[PDB]
Amino acid sequence: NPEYKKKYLQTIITAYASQNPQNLSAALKLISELENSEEKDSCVTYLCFLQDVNVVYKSALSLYDVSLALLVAQKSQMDPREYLPFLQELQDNEPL
């Protein structure tokens, strides 16, 4: 149902993070798929509160996105000197 996806997104995120195989790929994919900058950040914060920030940031990398990765890396407590150059270098290169 489109309406359930519109509203009950956090339920789907909880479901994806709760199943033991930990389908975080689909969760982050749908989170980024949202066309917003307000709710998407809220859901990222919710996920980092729920699931460990380091694993979710690694999954964000594995999702092939840097903007989402940079958004998450602001919740990981790592020194920004230790990831900002990395994310910049990832950003200014070819897809492959």
Partner 1 sequence: PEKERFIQCCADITLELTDSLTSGTTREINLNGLITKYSKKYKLKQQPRLTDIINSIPDQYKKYLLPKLKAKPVRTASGIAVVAVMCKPHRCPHIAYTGNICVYCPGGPDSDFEYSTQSYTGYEPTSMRAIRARYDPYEQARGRVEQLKQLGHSIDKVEYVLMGGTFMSLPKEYREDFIVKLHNALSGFNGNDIDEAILYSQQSLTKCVGITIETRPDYCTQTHLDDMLKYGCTRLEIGVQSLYEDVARDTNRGHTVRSVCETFAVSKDAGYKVVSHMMPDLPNVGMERDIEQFKEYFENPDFRTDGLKIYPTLVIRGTGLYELWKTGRYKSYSANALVDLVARILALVPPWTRIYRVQRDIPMPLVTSGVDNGNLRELALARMKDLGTTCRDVRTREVGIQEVHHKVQPDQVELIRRDYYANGGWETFLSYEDPKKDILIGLLRLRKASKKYTYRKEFTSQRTSIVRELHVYGHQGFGTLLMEEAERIAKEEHGSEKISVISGVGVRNYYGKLGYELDGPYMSKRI
Partner 2 sequence: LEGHEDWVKSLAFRHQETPGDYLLCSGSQDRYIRLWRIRINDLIDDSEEDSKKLTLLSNKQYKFQIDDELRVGINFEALIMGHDDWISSLQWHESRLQLLAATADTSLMVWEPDETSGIWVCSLRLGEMSSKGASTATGSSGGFWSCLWFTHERMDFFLTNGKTGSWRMWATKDNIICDQRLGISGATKDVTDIAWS
The SS3 of residue 19 is: coil
Q: Which is closer to partner 2, CB of 30 or CB of 65?
A: 65
The residue within the footprint of partner 2, chosen from 66, 68, 72, 76 (CB under 8 A), is 66
* Interaction between residue 91 and partner 2 (CB under 8 A): yes
Binding site for partner 1 (CB under 8 A): 52, 54, 77-79, 82
* Interaction between residue 31 and partner 2 (CB under 8 A): no
- Residues constituting the chain: 96
How many angstroms separate the Cα of 1 from the Cα of each of 18, 27, 61, 69, 80? 21, 17, 29, 29, 40
Contacts with partner 2, residue ranges (CB under 8 A)? 66-67, 70-71, 74, 80, 84, 87-88, 91-92
